[PDB]
Amino acid sequence: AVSGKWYLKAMTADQEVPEKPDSVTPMILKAQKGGNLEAKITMLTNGQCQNITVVLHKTSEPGKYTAYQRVVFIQPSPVRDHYILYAEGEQIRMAKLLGRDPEQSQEALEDFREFSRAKGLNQEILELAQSETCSPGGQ
């Protein structure tokens, strides 16, 4: 049960991802029959809103899902109320800190940094601007 409302607080990649979001809404994880997960999030990118819907199909290995291209790994953080996503796919390796609370947390950042560097993800850690809604320029 990684289910419910999450805040996507940080991301990092093994490479340059020039699709930098300028802010993000909360991420919703809904549990569906079969143990599949539905992930909903909206991201502001260059004045537009990307409303994303990704189904994470369960697999044989526990904690691992498949999506898109990408295989997603989900595991808890040692820090209170934080979870870490680790993703390998189309090729990028990428990791995301999710937290139940939006307030910045140096401990979860520190461990997320410790988690990501031990996998070769050495690019910049971006802490994302949060907002309960995305609104495109002009709308």
Curated annotation (Swiss-Prot):
UniProt tissue specificity: Tongue epithelial tissue.
GO cellular component, one term: extracellular space
Source organism per UniProt: Canis lupus familiaris (Dog)
Bridged cysteine pairs (disulfide): C49-C134
Keyword Repeat tagged: no
Gene Ontology molecular function, alphabetical: small molecule binding
Full-protein residues shown: 30 to 174 of 174
Protein name as annotated: Major allergen Can f 1
Residues of this chain annotated as glycosylated in UniProt: N51
UniProt entry keywords in alphabetical sequence: Allergen, Disulfide bond, Glycoprotein, Secreted, Signal, Transport
Family of this protein: Belongs to the calycin superfamily. Lipocalin family.
Cellular localisation: Secreted
